[PDB]
Design an enzyme around this catalytic site. Sequence first.
Site, PDB file in Angstrom:
ATOM      1  CB  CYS A  18      -0.981   0.030   1.166  1.00  0.00           C
ATOM      2  SG  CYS A  18      -0.223  -0.257   2.788  1.00  0.00           S
ATOM      3  CG  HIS A  22      -4.884   1.056   2.981  1.00  0.00           C
ATOM      4  ND1 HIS A  22      -3.950   0.674   2.046  1.00  0.00           N
ATOM      5  CD2 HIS A  22      -5.876   1.633   2.301  1.00  0.00           C
ATOM      6  CE1 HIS A  22      -4.374   1.018   0.842  1.00  0.00           C
ATOM      7  NE2 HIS A  22      -5.542   1.605   0.973  1.00  0.00           N
ATOM      8  CG  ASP A  72      -6.649   3.506  -1.899  1.00  0.00           C
ATOM      9  OD1 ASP A  72      -5.578   2.985  -2.284  1.00  0.00           O
ATOM     10  OD2 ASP A  72      -7.336   3.070  -0.953  1.00  0.00           O
TER      11      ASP A  72
END
Lengths: 5, 431
Positions: free
Chosen positions: B271, B319, B342
């Site tokens: 991530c 995350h 994201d």
Amino acid sequence: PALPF
Amino acid sequence: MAEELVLERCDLELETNGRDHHTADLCREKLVVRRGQPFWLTLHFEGRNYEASVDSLTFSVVTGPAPSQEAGTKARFPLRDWTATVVDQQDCTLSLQLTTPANAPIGLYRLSLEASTGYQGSSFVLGHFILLFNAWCPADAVYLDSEEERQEYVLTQQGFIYQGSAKFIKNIPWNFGQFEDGILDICLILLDVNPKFLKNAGRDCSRRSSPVYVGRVVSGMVNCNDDQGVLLGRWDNNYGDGVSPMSWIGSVDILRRWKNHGCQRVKYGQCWVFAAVACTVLRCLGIPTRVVTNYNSAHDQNSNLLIEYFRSEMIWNFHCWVESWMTRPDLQPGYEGWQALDPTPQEKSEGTYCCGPVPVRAIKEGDLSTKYDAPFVFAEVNADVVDWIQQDDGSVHKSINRSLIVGLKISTKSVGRDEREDITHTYKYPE
Ligand SMILES: [Ca+2]
Ligand SMILES: [Ca+2]
């Protein structure tokens, strides 16, 4: 690292 | 009698323009400028100099493979909104000042000169310039009215990315290196090989006028999924045929490895790596961006805003994604500011692994109809944890689990300091 609970 | 103008060379004035447009590190070899702001040229002539009575010069700029005035990817302007004006004249040289509109498509422009004395016009290609988003310009969509924040979120090449767990917070240094040699060129390639460019190049270049569009493109193209994106994710602790996610110390080695092997997936990332590379690309393009870490980050798979266990969905120790600063004229008024993007693949949006931009404010208020992908991001930060427990009597009982709270201690690097800012308040109300 990223770890799922 | 008066014969035609003969150009020797166009001086792009890299050092002056570089300092003025905050692109000095980008401007050692080619002209890189920010939109909505004047920049200098100096034409050197061979025979006689420009004469206003005699000569009329016209300029042309074009970007992309199908430039047109309708799309905003081609402009024509006379030497006297794209403008060109005469600022000084000395012996053989003519000094100009060009301007670009604040809503111009970013990217590589080719600059031409038409020169006439009343008859057959002669043509000249003057050179090339890359035009970026301009956080310093009040008319630009990415405008950020704080200088210290522009420094941090656009210009700073080093930062800190938060990892670990809610209980045990740690960080690593990261070299974003947005202004290192070749990185801007790799960013332009990222946009040029993106699915929408492949489908309709002329329309894709036209829409690079928006940080929303560009932002969305990047959140797709940073992962290799569905496309020629950059990173392949891996989470099983076997990376012997690639690079460990934890080996990386900066975005530059990844972006360069991607370019060198012909835009091929880079093994491997997780991530923070995705978010970090996205921060590089967005900062390089001039969109103020930052990396945020979310502890107890939930993955909702069925859009019910609940994270469900059976005694099954996932909660991660942390995350990471990015936020980018921009207005949102595509939405209802009031949504300008930070937008969650994201680049890590989890849930598909519009048939593709991407996510955002969504206003952080929309997440906080629970305006989950706001684009893009607010329902998912809400669940990551503010979901209830549910156990479907099977009982001794064969029945299944729903129960709320409060042992692990989703969305804690959401963090990004402080402005101008080597310290952590908690921004949990921007995502969710306290209870
Ligand atoms: Ca992708
Ligand atoms: Ca669910």
